[PDB]
Amino acid sequence: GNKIHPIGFRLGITRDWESRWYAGKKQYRHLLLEDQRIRGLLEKELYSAGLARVDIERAADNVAVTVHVAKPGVVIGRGGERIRVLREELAKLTGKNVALNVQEVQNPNLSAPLVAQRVAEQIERRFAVRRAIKQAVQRVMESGAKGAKVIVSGRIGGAEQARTEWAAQGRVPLHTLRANIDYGFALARTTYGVLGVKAYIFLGEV
Amino acid sequence: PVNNRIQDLTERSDVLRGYLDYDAKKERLEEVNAELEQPDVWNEPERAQALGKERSSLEAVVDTLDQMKQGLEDVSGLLELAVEADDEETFNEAVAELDALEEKLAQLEFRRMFSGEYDSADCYLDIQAGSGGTEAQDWASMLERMYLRWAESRGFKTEIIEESEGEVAGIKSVTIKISGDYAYGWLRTETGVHRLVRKSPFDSGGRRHTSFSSAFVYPEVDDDIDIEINPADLRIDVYRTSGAGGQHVNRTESAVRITHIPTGIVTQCQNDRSQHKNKDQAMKQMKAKLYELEMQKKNAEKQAMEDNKSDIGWGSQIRSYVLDDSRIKDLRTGVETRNTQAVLDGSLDQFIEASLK
Amino acid sequence: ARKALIEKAKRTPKFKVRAYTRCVRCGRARSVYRFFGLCRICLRELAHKGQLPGVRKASW
RNA sequence: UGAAACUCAAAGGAAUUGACGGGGGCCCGCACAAGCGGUGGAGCAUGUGGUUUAAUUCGAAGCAACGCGAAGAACCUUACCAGGCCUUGACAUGCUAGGGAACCCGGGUGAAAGCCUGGGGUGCCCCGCGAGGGGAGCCCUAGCACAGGUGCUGCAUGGCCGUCGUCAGCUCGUGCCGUGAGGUGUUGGGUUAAGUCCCGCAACGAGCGCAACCCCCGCCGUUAGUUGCCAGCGGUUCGGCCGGGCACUCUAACGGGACUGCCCGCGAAAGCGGGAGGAAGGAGGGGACGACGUCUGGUCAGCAUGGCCCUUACGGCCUGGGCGACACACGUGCUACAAUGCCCACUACAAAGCGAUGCCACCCGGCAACGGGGAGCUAAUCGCAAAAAGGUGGGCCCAGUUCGGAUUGGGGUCUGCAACCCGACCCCAUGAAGCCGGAAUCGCUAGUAAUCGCGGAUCAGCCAUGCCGCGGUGAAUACG
RNA sequence: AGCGCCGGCCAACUCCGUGCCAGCAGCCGCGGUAAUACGGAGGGCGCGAGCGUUACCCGGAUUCACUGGGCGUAAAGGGC
RNA sequence: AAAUGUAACA
RNA sequence: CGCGGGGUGGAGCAGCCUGGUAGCUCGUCGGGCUCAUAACCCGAAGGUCGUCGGUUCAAAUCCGGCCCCCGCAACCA
Numbered sequence A: 001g002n003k004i005h006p007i008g009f010r011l012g013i014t015r016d017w018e019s020r021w022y023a024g025k026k027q028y029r030h031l032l033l034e035d036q037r038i039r040g041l042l043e044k045e046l047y048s049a050g051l052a053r054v055d056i057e058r059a060a061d062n063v064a065v066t067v068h069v070a071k072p073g074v075v076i077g078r079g080g081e082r083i084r085v086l087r088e089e090l091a092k093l094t095g096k097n098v099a100l101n102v103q104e105v106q107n108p109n110l111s112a113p114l115v116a117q118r119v120a121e122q123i124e125r126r127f128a129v130r131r132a133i134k135q136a137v138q139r140v141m142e143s144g145a146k147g148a149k150v151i152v153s154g155r156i157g158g159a160e161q162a163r164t165e166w167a168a169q170g171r172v173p174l175h176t177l178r179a180n181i182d183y184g185f186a187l188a189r190t191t192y193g194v195l196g197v198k199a200y201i202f203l204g205e206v
Numbered sequence B: 001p002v003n004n005r006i007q008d009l010t011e012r013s014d015v016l017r018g019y020l021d022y023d024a025k026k027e028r029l030e031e032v033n034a035e036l037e038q039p040d041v042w043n044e045p046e047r048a049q050a051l052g053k054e055r056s057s058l059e060a061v062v063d064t065l066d067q068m069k070q071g072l073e074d075v076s077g078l079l080e081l082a083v084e085a086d087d088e089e090t091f092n093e094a095v096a097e098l099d100a101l102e103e104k105l106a107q108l109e110f111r112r113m114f115s116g117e118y119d120s121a122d123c124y125l126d127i128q129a130g131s132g133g134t135e136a137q138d139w140a141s142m143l144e145r146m147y148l149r150w151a152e153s154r155g156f157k158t159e160i161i162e163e164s165e166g167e168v169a170g171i172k173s174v175t176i177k178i179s180g181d182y183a184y185g186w187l188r189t190e191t192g193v194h195r196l197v198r199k200s201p202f203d204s205g206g207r208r209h210t211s212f213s214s215a216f217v218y219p220e221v222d223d224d225i226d227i228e229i230n231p232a233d234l235r236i237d238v239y240r241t242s243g244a245g246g247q248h249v250n251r252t253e254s255a256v257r258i259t260h261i262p263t264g265i266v267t268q269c270q271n272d273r274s275q276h277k278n279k280d281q282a283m284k285q286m287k288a289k290l291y292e293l294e295m296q297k298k299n300a301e302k303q304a305m306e307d308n309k310s311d312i313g314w315g316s317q318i319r320s321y322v323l324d325d326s327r328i329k330d331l332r333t334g335v336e337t338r339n340t341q342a343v344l345d346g347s348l349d350q351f352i353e354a355s356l357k
Numbered sequence C: 001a002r003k004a005l006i007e008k009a010k011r012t013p014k015f016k017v018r019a020y021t022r023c024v025r026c027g028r029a030r031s032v033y034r035f036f037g038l039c040r041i042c043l044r045e046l047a048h049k050g051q052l053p054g055v056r057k058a059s060w
Numbered sequence D: 001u002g003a004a005a006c007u008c009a010a011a012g013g014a015a016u017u018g019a020c021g022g023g024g025g026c027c028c029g030c031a032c033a034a035g036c037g038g039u040g041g042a043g044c045a046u047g048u049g050g051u052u053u054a055a056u057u058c059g060a061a062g063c064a065a066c067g068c069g070a071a072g073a074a075c076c077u078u079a080c081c082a083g084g085c086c087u088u089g090a091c092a093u094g095c096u097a098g099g100g101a102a103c104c105c106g107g108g109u110g111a112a113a114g115c116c117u118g119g120g121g122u123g124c125c126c127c128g129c130g131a132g133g134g135g136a137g138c139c140c141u142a143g144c145a146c147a148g149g150u151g152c153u154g155c156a157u158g159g160c161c162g163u164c165g166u167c168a169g170c171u172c173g174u175g176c177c178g179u180g181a182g183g184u185g186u187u188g189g190g191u192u193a194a195g196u197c198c199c200g201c202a203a204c205g206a207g208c209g210c211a212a213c214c215c216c217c218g219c220c221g222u223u224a225g226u227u228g229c230c231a232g233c234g235g236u237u238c239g240g241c242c243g244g245g246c247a248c249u250c251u252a253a254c255g256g257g258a259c260u261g262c263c264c265g266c267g268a269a270a271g272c273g274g275g276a277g278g279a280a281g282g283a284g285g286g287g288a289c290g291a292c293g294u295c296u297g298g299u300c301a302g303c304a305u306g307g308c309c310c311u312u313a314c315g316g317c318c319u320g321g322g323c324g325a326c327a328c329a330c331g332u333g334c335u336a337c338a339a340u341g342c343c344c345a346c347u348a349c350a351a352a353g354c355g356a357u358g359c360c361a362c363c364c365g366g367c368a369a370c371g372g373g374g375a376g377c378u379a380a381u382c383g384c385a386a387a388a389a390g391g392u393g394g395g396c397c398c399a400g401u402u403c404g405g406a407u408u409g410g411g412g413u414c415u416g417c418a419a420c421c422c423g424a425c426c427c428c429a430u431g432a433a434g435c436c437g438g439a440a441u442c443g444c445u446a447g448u449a450a451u452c453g454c455g456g457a458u459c460a461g462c463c464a465u466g467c468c469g470c471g472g473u474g475a476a477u478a479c480g
Numbered sequence E: 001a002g003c004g005c006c007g008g009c010c011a012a013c014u015c016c017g018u019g020c021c022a023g024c025a026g027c028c029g030c031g032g033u034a035a036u037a038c039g040g041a042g043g044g045c046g047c048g049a050g051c052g053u054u055a056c057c058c059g060g061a062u063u064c065a066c067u068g069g070g071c072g073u074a075a076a077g078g079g080c
Numbered sequence F: 001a002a003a004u005g006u007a008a009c010a
Numbered sequence G: 001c002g003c004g005g006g007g008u009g010g011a012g013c014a015g016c017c018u019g020g021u022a023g024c025u026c027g028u029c030g031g032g033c034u035c036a037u038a039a040c041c042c043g044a045a046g047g048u049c050g051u052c053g054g055u056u057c058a059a060a061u062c063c064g065g066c067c068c069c070c071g072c073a074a075c076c077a
């Protein structure tokens, strides 16, 4: 148990914060809590849509939430049905002017959180874990990634002896700062226990 | 706070109805009241005396349990008959009641311990290691600690007579004098081989191992093998020696033979010339030979114990200390405490009280 | 004893001394920082995610 | 010459990969050696083993547990104990039925919780000049689902971390060798801090590691000039205070700079030795960063989670106690045993940080802790703030002392609802052990050790001598 | 209409109970609180007035080798 | 010149 | 019954005769070395001198009586 988190090790170099604003000593805990609840609500509701990143902006009594997703329509709805419903639930929680945007995820198979969530869904469906990991890595590499690595840990297949099972292709240089590596984690609940899924996608070095 | 103490007098009284079997003794009580009821039953009064003494032997069970369900129930109605009328004398006079039935039930709990010849002698505890070795010698030392803290939390004296510490780590054997009151009653229901399934610290890669150690328990006797020689049973013959001596030996009855009548032990002496030197010597030799039989008895009874004393081995056991899922199970009654390192502290009362049935 | 404790810590007490901070995220009463309202563990955990504005790994 | 009974599920041959050797060869690391300062002895602080206890909650167990989870246990925390209480319940989603919703205010009992109870006005869309009729805003009462459990299992798990180890390694693709496990490559010669690079080679490539990309520090530039600075000219209340200026210092963003680049020499090359230039030289110093894996390592008690277990209780509230015990035992530290010292008085020189029921200038009362006044500062402005060792003077004169500051008596301050258990601080008095520590053992190779003080997180206060940082002064030694 | 079996050999899989106990076993091996290996059940496989077990013979056994084996280090060259 | 470490390796 | 020798920490022995002072070895207990045990290293604790009485100023010691232990002798008929 050793490796550093590959995103927090690149903050302000190759990857940018998800809550970008300023706040004073008296205030920043409360804005932080409100952010995390925004992420709880959306992170439950927008799971079926294909949620990847949740950016948050704050000026003064107004806040802009930018949702990255593979299925924008599942967020927006029919002409804006769900999109409006979201603002009502949202500014109900926030109690303030909550602007909610939606954006593409141009290629969901180069989104590490998405790949991770897809494998976790596969293994909750009793799929063959090894086969699935090889497939996920192949889908990421065919989508143009310069490297890929996928890891699954736990009671794989229901076995009593826990095990870690991983596959990789190309380059994943986790020691390189200027190397852009998207990272994602997904949690899979089975009848026999939890498995953890980690996805690293090496998009390119800057 | 008082109806919590009736809550408990009904708890020890119900499984008290279990081993006593009110259900199997209210039955036998009736056709002894029937046999003794027809006028011919003092026909061979040996038959009669055993049954009239039996009848209160069962009416100290049936009818004593009959004053516990009526008695407690007229206690719990009189203490509500004191709350809602503010009558504090109806509640001192229904507490003088709870101090009387707390003794007829205390008396009926001495069918557990008042049945074992000498369940009061200052007993000895004889703990032994067993299968496994180092692990079990560790577990043996753990188990002496367990009974020492037990005996302190019960008014006994923790008196250690003989140890021998194991050579790797622990104890191969120990003997403690549990110098206390009624000590043999409690610890005789601790006789057995204590298996300790456990997880082992002496095995390198940390494997789960089983190791056993025993606890044998006995009382105290007179331990005096100095039988006096009484002239009612010695027959002493006198006759002539058989070798050199001269006109002596021929013409003098110097040799004696003392024969203990009930035993059949015979003994002679011819060593000296006086029959009284010889009568002296043969009294010694005769003392020592009945000191050797009374020795052979006692050892014979000991070997009867040893060969009837388990083996401290696999499948010869009474407990699990599966400390890898936190249980301690007494496979004999059998309970399941989950607070394991509280048993090693000395909560043996649990198993003991339920094992005296 | 815990959800009742993360709950009792919220309600204002009978005496202002009895107030402590608990980690608003996991309920931990130990090593709670005032300025995040988080414990040291959740602090590290969100910080690694990048969901703490401006917060970064410090190196000198 | 030569059995059997009985017994075992093997006994075996060779070869492979490891691991190990009181086998060898070649290397490396404060590993030893060379040194300097400690620990082990004392008193105290702190954690732990024990023991005690109603409870002294729980975990951590050689290195890699033991000032560790605990970056703040009087209540709270708190998970333990004792006692007093509550039963869809401190909390979620429900569905149903009664009250009135909602919110605030008191009374009784009680240690408090809790139990009892007396107050008072509900918007809506509505028939409303009318009793009256709701819906669902939220609460109350009775239910039934359910909640809740720091109860067990880290040997069912995720996540995160410790460790070997910043060690130089661990593999894959194709080809080749072998019946095969597997080998080759990755070995060899040279070289490097390095599986670093060079040369050779049935191998030729590739990946994860190494390195680099990132941060701080060292030189310089550009852009900026206040709340920072003051070289020069004016005033100068006698203080960068004022004019004024941004030079300098600084502050903080962006760049330059070092690449064995250049000369000598040895080299097949890679490199190595030496020299210059330069603030810096051969990774410039420090940091972040930790390969495949190992320890069935650690954590179900941070969180999550499979299963097993509890359901007027293994849940919940409260008051009090315990976590602070003390015949003992170990680990980590603090202060010392003194003259290269101690005390007093006066006088200099930092950095990094923190601060609106906060940091507190200055004034006054008190020997003091502190208290009462009171300006400034959303803080490069104002404040914490004095840095301490040092320097200058004076006292001590080798003693258990003007060393040492434990223990205890007495008197106070502050925080807090409350300092008995069980707080910190001040003052008077008391003034212990300790005269440099057995066996044994730890750290450190340069701005390092040693020594000196300053800040912060936690935090009402604090048991901090801990931890994470900051600067001041500043060594010894390395044959091997 | 019954009997055997359903860990591999060897065709047929789940739930509960149990918790190195009770037990299974032809060999290898199963059982220490999620057992396709124990016991019951549901389901399944194989046979069917039969189905299994024990005993014995040949086979598999080129494991006495005539067909059809071996003896440097596995058992095996006699000391010459 | 210097002994030993049983009993349940997935 | 005789002669003469002994009894001293947990074990085995020394100390007496020429009285004041109880020692050695092993063990036991606390600490170290080791991953751990043994071995080793450092420190510590430990004896009514069989009993009664008493010689003397004073007894483990000297002198009586008893109590267990060991050795020898117990012959001539």
Ligand SMILES: [Mg+2]
Pocket (backbone or CB within 6 Å): B242, B243
């Ligand atoms: Mg004759």
Ligand SMILES: [Mg+2]
Pocket (backbone or CB within 6 Å): B250, B251, B252, B253
């Ligand atoms: Mg005659």
Ligand SMILES: [Mg+2]
Pocket (backbone or CB within 6 Å): B248, B251, B252
């Ligand atoms: Mg005669």
Ligand SMILES: [Mg+2]
Pocket (backbone or CB within 6 Å): B341
């Ligand atoms: Mg314990």
Ligand SMILES: [Mg+2]
Pocket (backbone or CB within 6 Å): C001
């Ligand atoms: Mg509880």
Ligand SMILES: [Mg+2]
Pocket (backbone or CB within 6 Å): C002
């Ligand atoms: Mg929870």
Ligand SMILES: [Mg+2]
Pocket (backbone or CB within 6 Å): C017, C018, C019, C020
């Ligand atoms: Mg507090």
Ligand SMILES: [Mg+2]
Pocket (backbone or CB within 6 Å): C020, C021, C022, C029, C030, C031, C032
């Ligand atoms: Mg807190």
Ligand SMILES: [Mg+2]
Pocket (backbone or CB within 6 Å): none
């Ligand atoms: Mg071999």
Ligand SMILES: [Mg+2]
Pocket (backbone or CB within 6 Å): none
């Ligand atoms: Mg080999």
Ligand SMILES: [Mg+2]
Pocket (backbone or CB within 6 Å): none
């Ligand atoms: Mg070697």
Ligand SMILES: [Mg+2]
Pocket (backbone or CB within 6 Å): D030
């Ligand atoms: Mg060292």
Ligand SMILES: [Mg+2]
Pocket (backbone or CB within 6 Å): none
């Ligand atoms: Mg040294």
Ligand SMILES: [Mg+2]
Pocket (backbone or CB within 6 Å): none
């Ligand atoms: Mg030294």
Ligand SMILES: [Mg+2]
Pocket (backbone or CB within 6 Å): D039, D040
């Ligand atoms: Mg020391």
Ligand SMILES: [Mg+2]
Pocket (backbone or CB within 6 Å): none
């Ligand atoms: Mg010390």
